[PDB]
Structure 1
Amino acid sequence: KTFTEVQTERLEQADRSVLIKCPSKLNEKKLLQYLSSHGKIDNYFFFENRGIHALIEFSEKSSVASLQAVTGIPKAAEHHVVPYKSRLFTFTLKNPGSQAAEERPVKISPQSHIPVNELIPKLCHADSISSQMYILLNEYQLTEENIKLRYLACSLVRDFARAYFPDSTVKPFGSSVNTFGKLGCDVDMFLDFHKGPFEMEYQMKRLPSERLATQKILSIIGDCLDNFGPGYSSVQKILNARCPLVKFSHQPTGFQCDLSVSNSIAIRCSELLYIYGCLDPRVRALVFSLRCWARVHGLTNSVPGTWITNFSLTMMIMFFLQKRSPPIIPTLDQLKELADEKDKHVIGGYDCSFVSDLSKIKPTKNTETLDELLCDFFQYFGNFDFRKNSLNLRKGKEVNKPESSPLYIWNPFEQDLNISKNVNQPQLEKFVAMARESAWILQKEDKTQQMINKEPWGLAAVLIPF
């Protein structure tokens, strides 16, 4: 299945889904038996976040309308509430003293990964380094339940926008959908907004220039999220940034969210990364471990600045994997060649085209183990000449740097842009030093003796401070 098919299918599923704040005492079967009267239920689950919440995915969207019909406005807060009716519900018993079935406990689907301290033991008790990186991956990656919750959050924000742009969509991009998302990560959202003798037309208010329109639209949705709600808080409008942005927390799901107007270049990146992530499990294994490594050594940071970003790091990892013998993943120009007329995408002059079908890509013949790749990553970039060379992911080669920035990574979809232009000399040097130390640790450590000594080894040794 292609990225685009997965997006559509996930959004269509979210479109016919709701959230129900459950009561203290909860009989799952009765609730589901009741909710099913409004229509068939394809999927559901429960999770914990300031109480027990449940996601309900109906087979028909009409089921949502049916359920909405019988739902009421909090009688306890009559004229004291903003009567905006969304898909967030709060179920309570009609006759509290008529609970007629055995109350069982419910299975709570986890929405956050276990912390680093708890992860180290599990890594240390693994057999090899490969397995360590697969433990980490499995502990960290997004669950099916979490993904559905992310798409639903998008779907609730969409409903606000459509009020006046009926054909709009709010689509997740970035780590949420590029296969490299870890539990607890932000949800990045793109708003995408576009016979007689008389020529008949609607009267419609015109919009200003692209940027100014984006700012007003995002400002108003921000205001709505803040005031029409429910569950949105810490709504922070950052409309003056290069890319206008609204940040907000969504309390029912517990996500932190970023909303901007659609940038089709950024979506192609997400699809590019999706392909790379789907082509081979080692790709995702390496990313998750190296992201974690960077965070632990203070190379990355939650606030923008001179630090390397996960996006940049992720791109450096793809470049590494492009330069193997033989390559674990193909280059972008190779994917452009395989791209037929169905997959052609030009976005402001530059050809952002590449294949969508995974079948067309021949599998790699590379059989290197993660053990070798992790150390070689550190080895490779530890001894990389960042002053003379830059990273081109189209060619998959080291080339001369168009600009004199310390760390230059060629933006694969735009001609002379550097995705890591923010990075200064100090931060790059610290990365190189951490990379070199990490390689040294791995190359010349006694793995067996450290297991005996009950001390860190392999991935675990590079995931603790120096």
Structure 2
Amino acid sequence: KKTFTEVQTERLEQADRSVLIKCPSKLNEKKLLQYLSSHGKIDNYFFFENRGIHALIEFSEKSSVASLQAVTGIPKAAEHHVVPYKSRLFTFTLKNPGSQAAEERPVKISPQSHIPVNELIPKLCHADSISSQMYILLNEYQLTEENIKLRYLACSLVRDFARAYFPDSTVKPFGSSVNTFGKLGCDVDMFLDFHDKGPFEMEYQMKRLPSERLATQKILSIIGDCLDNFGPGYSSVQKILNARCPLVKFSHQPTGFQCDLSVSNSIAIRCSELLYIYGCLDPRVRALVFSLRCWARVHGLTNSVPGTWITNFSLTMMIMFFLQKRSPPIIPTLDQLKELADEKDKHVIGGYDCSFVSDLSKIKPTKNTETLDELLCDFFQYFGNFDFRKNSLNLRKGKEVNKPESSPLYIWNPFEQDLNISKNVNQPQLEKFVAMARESAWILQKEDKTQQMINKEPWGLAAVLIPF
């Protein structure tokens, strides 16, 4: 019965006691771990390729990090010419390169990126059914245990800067990184949450802060500067402080992730939890999202830069809606969750009741037995013939409703009164989605699967994951 909030805490606690070691060219796995173990017990570890062999070490005790740091030196080779900020990024070399005294064995490399689309298409064609195809993609794309540990670590490193002056700060991931829908190679979205008996009243002297937004801008501005200059391995630091939600984008060389740092927004975190739930409730949920996400990227309906396009988040929200409207529903409405919540799970933010259940056992498993074969096609059919001018998507009620605005695509932000999450989406783009969906359905409906396999040509999911 592991709640999102539970899982997050354990993950953070583990990344908290983890480090990164750039390995020697000729690496002896055993001698390394044997050595390191001297500083403390090791719960987990793995190796990955990134401009050389790096290795993530997760000690059982946080004290092991101090222990290891205690015997780590500053590069005297390059001595006064560096910024002497110490963190958990280490570089190991052999004292005596000519004292190599055991058999060189290779090391297992955990992959941190997924295969390209073109490499995937063949594998999909050799599958049996569509269900299989979708589940292949899912597996080939989803985040690995190692990848996750690596994401949480990246957050943990960024935190360490914040604590300098807000000891109680936390850097926590949200979005795809933690909501079960993360594909390999995605960005790590980080939220900085910073504040959280004599005859005398004795008090610390402490410098006052400005307004929420103005302080936010300054804290991020300074952290940004530190990432850049105390580093190491932070590049393309981009201070985008003036947006609706102040932001620092940056590229982290050691973990390979590009990242987005912003100050805690508890509305966005509740989304990520809600999506965490849905994803956990049924594998069909995840399967669909991943495939339809890929579909969208393939047909240029989505884009890595913001704009008039649909965002994966909105698209994900549309999919959740779709799954709410099954007979019977595959996932419950948000209100159905709110009803099952106890006082423990009561959260009310910015006026609006963002309450819903945390324990998954409280929810009744779905009776629905639809295969993905159907759900994939039905999705295209459903939205292909959806009346976007007359209707909007409400995930609280799980019903089509009247539009409180005159935007082309309106999706009810579930944790705000009166907010369109697809407000950015224009008519031209929406129309292309509908076209692409209607083409996609038509193909799936009127295609000869058995005969396409025989011809070696694409079919099912593959037929809609190639451009038209």
Write out per-residue CA displacement over residues 159-197 of structure 1, whole angstroms, 9 at most, x where no aligned residue.
000000000000000000000000000000000001101
| Counterpart for residue 11 of structure 1 | 12
Q: Structure 1 length as normaliser, TM-score?
A: 1.00
Distance 1:388 1:217 in 2: 44
Counterpart secondary structure, 2:293? helix
* Within-5 A mapping of 1:377-392: 377-392=379-394
Counterpart secondary structure, 1:233? strand
| Counterpart for residue 68 of structure 2 | 67
Distance 2:171 2:78 in 1: 31
Shift of 1:99: 1.2
Shift of 1:95: 1.2
| Counterpart for residue 424 of structure 2 | 422
Shift of 1:137: 0.1
Write out per-residue CA displacement over residues 239-261 of structure 1, whole angstroms, 9 at most, x where no aligned residue.
01100000000000100000000
Shift of 1:223: 0.2
Shift of 1:102: 1.2
Counterpart secondary structure, 2:222? helix
Distance 1:238 1:30 in 2: 45
Write out per-residue CA displacement over residues 254-308 of structure 1, whole angstroms, 9 at most, x where no aligned residue.
0000000000000000000000000000000000000000000000000000000
Counterpart secondary structure, 1:258? strand
Counterpart secondary structure, 1:95? coil
| Counterpart for residue 218 of structure 1 | 220
Distance 1:300 1:262 in 2: 26
Distance 1:109 1:188 in 2: 22
Distance 1:421 1:204 in 2: 42
Which of 375, 378, 384 is matched with 1:376 structurally? 378
Q: Which runs of 5+ in 1 are unaligned?
A: none
Distance 1:311 1:132 in 2: 23
Counterpart secondary structure, 1:38? coil
Distance 1:458 1:430 in 2: 21
Distance 1:93 1:397 in 2: 65
Shift of 1:341: 0.2
Write out per-residue CA displacement over residues 334-376 of structure 1, whole angstroms, 9 at most, x where no aligned residue.
0000000000000011000000000000000000000000000
Shift of 1:333: 0.2
Alignment pair present for 1:296 and 2:281: no
Shift of 1:201: 0.7
Shift of 1:101: 1.4
Distance 1:103 1:346 in 2: 58
Shift of 1:96: 1.2
Distance 1:20 1:231 in 2: 13
Shift of 1:90: 0.0
Shift of 1:154: 0.2
Counterpart secondary structure, 2:118? helix
Shift of 1:116: 0.3
Write out per-residue CA displacement over residues 371-402 of structure 1, whole angstroms, 9 at most, x where no aligned residue.
00000000000000000000000000000000
Distance 1:82 1:314 in 2: 43
Q: Structure 2 length as normaliser, TM-score?
A: 0.99
Distance 1:21 1:49 in 2: 9
| Counterpart for residue 315 of structure 2 | 313
Distance 1:453 1:98 in 2: 59
Distance 1:110 1:357 in 2: 32
Distance 1:374 1:425 in 2: 24
Which of 428, 443, 446 is matched with 1:444 structurally? 446
| Counterpart for residue 170 of structure 1 | 171
Distance 2:209 2:368 in 1: 53
Write out per-residue CA displacement over residues 122-159 of structure 1, whole angstroms, 9 at most, x where no aligned residue.
00000000000000000000000000000000000000
Counterpart secondary structure, 1:200? strand
Q: Which runs of 5+ in 2 are unaligned?
A: none
Counterpart secondary structure, 2:186? coil
Distance 2:453 2:152 in 1: 42
Distance 1:205 1:387 in 2: 53
| Length, aligned pairs only | 466
Q: Give every structure 1 segment of 4 or more consecutive aligned residues whose post-TM-superposition deviation is greater than 6 Å.
A: none
| Counterpart for residue 348 of structure 2 | 346
Shift of 1:235: 0.3
Distance 2:436 2:311 in 1: 16
Counterpart secondary structure, 1:13? helix
Distance 2:312 2:375 in 1: 19
Write out per-residue CA displacement over residues 49-96 of structure 1, whole angstroms, 9 at most, x where no aligned residue.
100000000000000000000000011110000000000000011111
Distance 2:301 2:204 in 1: 54
**Identity %, equivalent residues:** 100
Shift of 1:416: 0.3
Shift of 1:215: 0.4
Write out per-residue CA displacement over residues 302-329 of structure 1, whole angstroms, 9 at most, x where no aligned residue.
0000000000000000000000000000
Counterpart secondary structure, 1:90? strand
Counterpart secondary structure, 2:74? coil
Instruction: State the Cα RMSD in Å.
Output: 0.4
